[PDB]
Structure 1
Amino acid sequence: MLKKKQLTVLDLHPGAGKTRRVLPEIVREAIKKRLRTVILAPTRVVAAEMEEALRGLPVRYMTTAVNVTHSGTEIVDLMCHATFTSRLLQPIRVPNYNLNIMDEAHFTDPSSIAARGYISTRVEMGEAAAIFMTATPPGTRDAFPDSNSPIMDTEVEVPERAWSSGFDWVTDHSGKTVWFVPSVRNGNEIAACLTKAGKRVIQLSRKTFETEFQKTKNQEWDFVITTDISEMGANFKADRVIDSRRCLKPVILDGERVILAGPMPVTHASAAQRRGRIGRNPNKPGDEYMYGGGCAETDEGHAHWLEARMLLDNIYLQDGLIASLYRPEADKVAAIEGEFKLRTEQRKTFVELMKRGDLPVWLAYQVASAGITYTDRRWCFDGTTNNTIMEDSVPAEVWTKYGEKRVLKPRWMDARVCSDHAALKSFKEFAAGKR
């Protein structure tokens, strides 16, 4: 695998031991061969599990998620996918790693897609080797891959709202269930319904993942209600997955706004990863996968692939050259390579709107490409009436940094800034000049 100009897809089935058995062997061989190596974890939680798998190997953990005193003599770095793309974008020296290992390489967040594009381009240039670890590489059509033990697969109607009757099978179960929902708001409703029926429920989403995931270890629970983030190597001691088979798809309309379309079917890759949370113990056959819909290739036209091109257009590669998306996922977007390349000061603004502003890539790009500086929030208030953001069926209101109460009405409307109460709270703070 470790020969320059090679990209290997390590596609062993979910739970085959890619992270705990194969990765340490790759890292040992890399160190023997004096390959400057990066290991890319999708989340802080996976980063911490990798430290356990790699314990004693000389690895620099470029994350506060791990408490280790480094030798200063590691030639293997571990960081999150997002950290890699972030450091590429910033005026910070990122080593030209000889070996690029991406764990949970199916992750479809923009920074993960961008990271794959950059890495696969360096490999295509003959500059580096790469290993993408995933059961479900891009364009996989198999929602039912092999498992460590047999899974009972049942197509069944799955609730997406509170219910009073008609789903006894949900609550009659005595084991532990991981339940994939299409949104935080949908999980909040199902979670309240299960809590009312006497169940102990933990909710996971991107924003809450590290804190809340720890509860799955520290307390007894009946249900984990999770968004798609738990597709990314999150492991549970569960005997059932309930899968809505639905997700939200961000869609750019007319180059002008972003809506969260759906819910609509997940990809085969997503369904396989959701299912893949169970059947992982060869000694516990008969874990259950209950699935409420079909799969479809809903990554086609999904805004994350356009956002990945906005990131890659702003990463230095060599002179004016620009990294391509990883070939198998390159047709998910219709983008002119280099169309999103920004001049130095607009690029810095773009980066800061994402890193400090916590804005979605697309919205950060609209603001930066308009020549607005990071701290200039006038655009959060001067949009069309139809861009009015609503809070409890009334226009959301903030006090501007000038001390004026205004309706939140952004010039560019990205549905991700108000997809749930926490998102809207964060965006209100942004519009008020509080970060």
Structure 2
Amino acid sequence: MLKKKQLTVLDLHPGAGKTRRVLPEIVREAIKKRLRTVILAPTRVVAAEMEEALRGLPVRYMTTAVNVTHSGTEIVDLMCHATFTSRLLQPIRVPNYNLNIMDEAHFTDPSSIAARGYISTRVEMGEAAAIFMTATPPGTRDAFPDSNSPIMDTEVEVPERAWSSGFDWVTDHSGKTVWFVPSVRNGNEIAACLTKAGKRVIQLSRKTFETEFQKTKNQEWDFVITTDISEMGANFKADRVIDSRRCLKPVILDGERVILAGPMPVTHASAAQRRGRIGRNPNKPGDEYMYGGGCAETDEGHAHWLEARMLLDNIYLQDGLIASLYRPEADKVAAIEGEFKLRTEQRKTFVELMKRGDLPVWLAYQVASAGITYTDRRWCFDGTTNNTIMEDSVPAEVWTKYGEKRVLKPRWMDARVCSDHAALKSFKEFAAGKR
């Protein structure tokens, strides 16, 4: 696996031991061969689980999620998928790793797709080896893979709103349930309905993941209501998964705006990962998987693959060459390699709008390519009337950095800046010049 010019896909079924059993063996072999190695974790929670599996091995943990006193002689680095891509983009020297290991390599966030593109190109060039660890590689058509113990799979109508009757099976259950919803707002309504019925509910989403995930260990719960973030190695002690089989899809319209389309069917990879949360204990057969719709290839035309191209066009590889997306996911976007390449100063603005501004990739690109500087927020207020952002059925308003009350009306509308109360609050702070 570790020899140059080779990319290996380690596709053992969910719960087969890729992280706890296979990963330490690969690391020992890499250290024995003096291979400068990088291990890429999707989240800070997975990074913490990896430190437990690799305890006693000389690994440099480039994350504050782990508290370790490094020796300074480690040749193995561990960091998140987003940190790797961020460091490549910035004027920071990233070693050219001989071995690149990506855990939960199915992650479809733009920074993860970009990391796969960069690593696979280095391998194609004959410069590095790579191991992608996932039960569901890109393009998988099997939503029902093998598991540690048998699962009861049931196609059933799943509520997506509060209900009064017709879904007794949901609340009549006495075990623990992990329920995947298409959005934070949809999970809020189902959570409220379950709480009113006497259930103890925890909610998880990208922004709250590390903090709220700890509650799944620290307190008794009946339900976990989660978005698709829990498809990336988050493990639970549960006996049932309820899966709406739906997700939101960011779509770029006429290259001028981003909408959150759907809810629409999840990919087979996502469904297999959601189901994969249960059937993990070989001594507990009969875990349930209730699913409320079919699968479709909704990653085709999904904005994340276009956003991965914007990131890869701005990463130095060799002279004017640009890394391609990983071959099995390369047809998900129609893009000219190099079309998003920015000049030095615009690239710096693009990076800062993402890193400090916390803006979606697409939106950060529109601002930086228009020649606007990071602190210039006039674009948050000079868009067309149809770009007015609404809050509680009335236009959102902020005090500008000049002390003037203005309606939020960005020149470029990206629905992810107001997909929920938390996102809109963060965007309002940005428009006001507060970060």
Query: Which deviations, in whole Å up to 9, do the C-alpha atoms of 1:1-55 show, x marking residues without a partner?
Result: 0000000000000000000000000000000000000000000000000000001
Q: Deviation of residue 200 (structure 1)?
A: 0.3
Q: State the SS of the aligned residue for 2:114.
A: helix
> 2 CA distance for matches of 1:165 and 1:181?
20
Q: Deviation of residue 348 (structure 1)?
A: 0.2
Task: Please give the residue correspondences for 1:50-89 in structure 2 after superposition, counting only pairs within 5 Å.
Answer: 50-89=50-89
Query: Which deviations, in whole Å up to 9, do the C-alpha atoms of 1:135-191 show, x marking residues without a partner?
Result: 000000000000000000000000000000000000000000000000000000000
Q: Deviation of residue 318 (structure 1)?
A: 0.2
- Answer yes or no: is 1:7 the counterpart of 2:7: yes
Match of 2:329 in 1: 329
Query: Which deviations, in whole Å up to 9, do the C-alpha atoms of 1:371-409 show, x marking residues without a partner?
Result: 000000000000000000000000000000000000000
Q: Deviation of residue 130 (structure 1)?
A: 0.2
Q: Kindly tell me the number of residue pairs found equivalent between the two proteins.
A: 435
Q: State the SS of the aligned residue for 1:346.
A: helix
Query: Which deviations, in whole Å up to 9, do the C-alpha atoms of 1:396-424 show, x marking residues without a partner?
Result: 00000000000000000000000000000
> 1 CA distance for matches of 2:279 and 2:301?
32
> 2 CA distance for matches of 1:378 and 1:129?
46
Q: Deviation of residue 332 (structure 1)?
A: 0.1
> 2 CA distance for matches of 1:20 and 1:407?
52
> 2 CA distance for matches of 1:60 and 1:360?
30
> 1 CA distance for matches of 2:383 and 2:286?
54
Query: Which deviations, in whole Å up to 9, do the C-alpha atoms of 1:32-88 show, x marking residues without a partner?
Result: 000000000000000000000001100000000000000000000000000000000
Match of 2:248 in 1: 248
> 1 CA distance for matches of 2:341 and 2:56?
42
Query: Which deviations, in whole Å up to 9, do the C-alpha atoms of 1:214-270 show, x marking residues without a partner?
Result: 000000000000000000000000000000000000000000000000000000000
> 2 CA distance for matches of 1:427 and 1:293?
34
> 1 CA distance for matches of 2:10 and 2:209?
26
Q: Deviation of residue 319 (structure 1)?
A: 0.1
> 2 CA distance for matches of 1:57 and 1:243?
38
> 1 CA distance for matches of 2:271 and 2:415?
24
> 2 CA distance for matches of 1:288 and 1:2?
39
> 2 CA distance for matches of 1:277 and 1:351?
35
- Answer yes or no: is 1:175 the counterpart of 2:179: no
> 2 CA distance for matches of 1:126 and 1:204?
41
Q: Deviation of residue 118 (structure 1)?
A: 0.1
Match of 2:404 in 1: 404
> 2 CA distance for matches of 1:430 and 1:375?
9
Query: Where do 4+ consecutive residues of structure 1 move more than 6 Å?
Result: none
> 2 CA distance for matches of 1:345 and 1:119?
26
Query: Which deviations, in whole Å up to 9, do the C-alpha atoms of 1:92-136 show, x marking residues without a partner?
Result: 000000000000000000000000000000000000000000000
Q: State the SS of the aligned residue for 1:206.
A: coil
Q: State the SS of the aligned residue for 1:247.
A: strand
> 2 CA distance for matches of 1:150 and 1:300?
32
Q: Deviation of residue 308 (structure 1)?
A: 0.1
> 1 CA distance for matches of 2:158 and 2:19?
32
Q: State the SS of the aligned residue for 1:97.
A: coil
Q: Deviation of residue 322 (structure 1)?
A: 0.2
> Structure 1 stretches of 5 or more lacking a match?
none
Q: State the SS of the aligned residue for 1:122.
A: helix
> 2 CA distance for matches of 1:373 and 1:423?
22
> 2 CA distance for matches of 1:30 and 1:204?
36
> 2 CA distance for matches of 1:142 and 1:136?
8
> 2 CA distance for matches of 1:200 and 1:126?
53
Match of 2:23 in 1: 23
> 1 CA distance for matches of 2:73 and 2:194?
51
> 1 CA distance for matches of 2:171 and 2:56?
44
Match of 2:289 in 1: 289
Q: Deviation of residue 356 (structure 1)?
A: 0.2
Query: Which deviations, in whole Å up to 9, do the C-alpha atoms of 1:317-347 show, x marking residues without a partner?
Result: 0000000000000000000000000000000
> 1 CA distance for matches of 2:360 and 2:237?
33
> Structure 2 stretches of 5 or more lacking a match?
none
Q: State the SS of the aligned residue for 1:290.
A: strand
Q: Deviation of residue 273 (structure 1)?
A: 0.1
TM-score w.r.t. the length of structure 2 is 1.00
- Answer yes or no: is 1:163 the counterpart of 2:163: yes
Match of 1:110 in 2: 110
Match of 1:215 in 2: 215
Q: State the SS of the aligned residue for 2:207.
A: helix
> 2 CA distance for matches of 1:113 and 1:317?
16
Identity %: 100
> 1 CA distance for matches of 2:19 and 2:262?
33
Q: State the SS of the aligned residue for 1:207.
A: coil
> 1 CA distance for matches of 2:184 and 2:405?
29
